[PDB]
């Protein structure tokens, strides 16, 4: 999928996600839940600053969602 | 699915960010299938202006950017 598969995968891996939004906003955290419209429940969110523990985001902000995993090794 | 999640947040206190970056703090009284959200005991802060106190506020769901949920909300049980 476009972004829907970034998200299903992100929920599966519990892996951090960079949500690039509308007018130059970025949100970095974990996707708990999400729907087809890219509405999301998010935890441990860093807004690009500001920390937000739990958040409901509406889909129509979203341009692109990028994965940001932690990897061991070179 | 995620719309219902919102609909179970009656009596929460939340901070809603509007698309213009106005910040609405208040207690949820109802959220409807379009995410239109009704609050009571409201503190509305426009970007770079002193806040306005209000008894109630109703916000168009399409005017909403995100809901800053309470720290102690049990996300898991809301999403059965």
UniProtKB/Swiss-Prot annotation, chain A:
A GO molecular-function descriptor: RNA binding
Locations listed in the record: Cytoplasm, Cytosol; Nucleus
Domain Sm: 4-71
GO CC, one annotated term: nucleoplasm
Subcellular location, principal: cytoplasm
Domain of life: Eukaryota
Key words of the record: Acetylation, Cytoplasm, Isopeptide bond, mRNA processing, mRNA splicing, Nucleus, Phosphoprotein, Ribonucleoprotein, Spliceosome, Ubl conjugation
GO biological process: 7-methylguanosine cap hypermethylation; mRNA splicing, via spliceosome; RNA splicing; spliceosomal complex assembly; spliceosomal snRNP assembly; U2-type prespliceosome assembly
Similarity annotation: Belongs to the snRNP core protein family.
Subunit structure: Core component of the spliceosomal U1, U2, U4 and U5 small nuclear ribonucleoproteins (snRNPs), the building blocks of the spliceosome. Most spliceosomal snRNPs contain a common set of Sm proteins, SNRPB, SNRPD1, SNRPD2, SNRPD3, SNRPE, SNRPF and SNRPG that assemble in a heptameric protein ring on the Sm site of the small nuclear RNA to form the core snRNP. Component of the U1 snRNP. The U1 snRNP is composed of the U1 snRNA and the 7 core Sm proteins SNRPB, SNRPD1, SNRPD2, SNRPD3, SNRPE, SNRPF and SNRPG, and at least three U1 snRNP-specific proteins SNRNP70/U1-70K, SNRPA/U1-A and SNRPC/U1-C.
Additional remark text: In the autoimmune disease systemic lupus erythematosus, antinuclear antibodies are developed with Sm specificity.
Job of this protein: Plays a role in pre-mRNA splicing as a core component of the spliceosomal U1, U2, U4 and U5 small nuclear ribonucleoproteins (snRNPs), the building blocks of the spliceosome. Component of both the pre-catalytic spliceosome B complex and activated spliceosome C complexes. As a component of the minor spliceosome, involved in the splicing of U12-type introns in pre-mRNAs.
Protein name: Small nuclear ribonucleoprotein Sm D2
Span of the entire protein shown here: 26 to 118 of 118
UniProtKB/Swiss-Prot annotation, chain B:
Highest taxon listed in the record's lineage: Eukaryota
GO terms, biological process: 7-methylguanosine cap hypermethylation; mRNA splicing, via spliceosome; RNA splicing; spliceosomal complex assembly; spliceosomal snRNP assembly; U2-type prespliceosome assembly
Cellular compartment(s): Cytoplasm, Cytosol; Nucleus
Molecular functions (GO terms): RNA binding; U1 snRNP binding
Stretches assigned to the Sm domain: 1-73
Keyword Repeat: yes
Residue runs in coiled coils: none
Annotated keywords: Cytoplasm, Isopeptide bond, Methylation, mRNA processing, mRNA splicing, Nucleus, Repeat, Ribonucleoprotein, Spliceosome, Ubl conjugation
Any one cellular-component term (Gene Ontology): SMN-Sm protein complex
Region (Sufficient for interaction with CLNS1A): 1-79
Modifications the protein undergoes after translation, according to the UniProt entry: Methylated on arginine residues by PRMT5 and PRMT7; probable asymmetric dimethylation which is required for assembly and biogenesis of snRNPs.
Main location: cytoplasm
Homology family: Belongs to the snRNP core protein family.
Function, as annotated: Plays a role in pre-mRNA splicing as a core component of the spliceosomal U1, U2, U4 and U5 small nuclear ribonucleoproteins (snRNPs), the building blocks of the spliceosome. Component of both the pre-catalytic spliceosome B complex and activated spliceosome C complexes. As a component of the minor spliceosome, involved in the splicing of U12-type introns in pre-mRNAs. May act as a charged protein scaffold to promote snRNP assembly or strengthen snRNP-snRNP interactions through non-specific electrostatic contacts with RNA.
Subunit details: Core component of the spliceosomal U1, U2, U4 and U5 small nuclear ribonucleoproteins (snRNPs), the building blocks of the spliceosome. Most spliceosomal snRNPs contain a common set of Sm proteins, SNRPB, SNRPD1, SNRPD2, SNRPD3, SNRPE, SNRPF and SNRPG that assemble in a heptameric protein ring on the Sm site of the small nuclear RNA to form the core snRNP. Component of the U1 snRNP. The U1 snRNP is composed of the U1 snRNA and the 7 core Sm proteins SNRPB, SNRPD1, SNRPD2, SNRPD3, SNRPE, SNRPF and SNRPG, and at least three U1 snRNP-specific proteins SNRNP70/U1-70K, SNRPA/U1-A and SNRPC/U1-C.
Note: In the autoimmune disease systemic lupus erythematosus, antinuclear antibodies are developed with Sm specificity.
Protein name: Small nuclear ribonucleoprotein Sm D1
Upper taxonomic lineage: Eukaryota, Metazoa, Chordata, Craniata, Vertebrata
Span covered, complete protein: 2 to 81 of 119
